[PDB]
Design a binder for these strands. Sequence first.
RNA 1: GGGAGUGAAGGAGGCUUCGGCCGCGAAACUUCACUCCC
Length: 228
Amino acid sequence: PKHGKRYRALLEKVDPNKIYTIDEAAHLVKELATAKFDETVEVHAKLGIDPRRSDQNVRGTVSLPHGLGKQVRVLAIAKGEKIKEAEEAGADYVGGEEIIQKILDGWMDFDAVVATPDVMGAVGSKLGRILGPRGLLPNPKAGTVGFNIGEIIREIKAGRIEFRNDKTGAIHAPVGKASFPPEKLADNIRAFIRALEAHKPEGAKGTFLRSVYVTTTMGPSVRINPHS
RNA sequence: GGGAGUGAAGGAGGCUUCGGCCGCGAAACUUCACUCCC
Ligand SMILES: [K+]
């Protein structure tokens, strides 16, 4: 694909035949994140599973040791004293079904959204099609839906991430910012990798982490050894 | 070796001959995968 000079340059910096260590990679990050903003670091792993087999779906969440160095605007749809509990946990905008029409008018000033199970009827059906493209819709297996809404909200704002393999058997997640210190990123990179392994399916066949990579928003990639 | 599509992820910037072009919509761009084609 037609690349820019900025990127053609980044290519000369990494060796595609070399399997870098989690730490070597963590040091390249700075030298690759040359876009005109604080690029995000990410890890991509091709998983030894059968995406078609519902029970071999790698899906979960995990807390990162050094956050995502990113501010997360969480919205909280709720019912009862739960509202008070959400406001307490630290959500940016708390509310009830009313939020539903507010969003149907064009309000998308949030990054995340959580909700108590008892509002999901209205939230599910109504906000379903408008929130669906951005992957904003609250879900139980996503960790976005729970009565312990303050704990869920507390967690997100602390740099907790989600991860679900895609239909091709690959899984991806952000693990920090290019501004992070080399080793902080590394702690974060091992964290996510360990999260994946603790979610290896029972009937999963063969080598689980077939490959694992490190990259930034606009830079190239470097294959790493998951156990470094 | 190159041209593309599809999925997921990251993403508010990306490219430029400096004329502007593209993107902040799912959409630019980039990554890992699933295919098509030359
Ligand atoms: K990328």
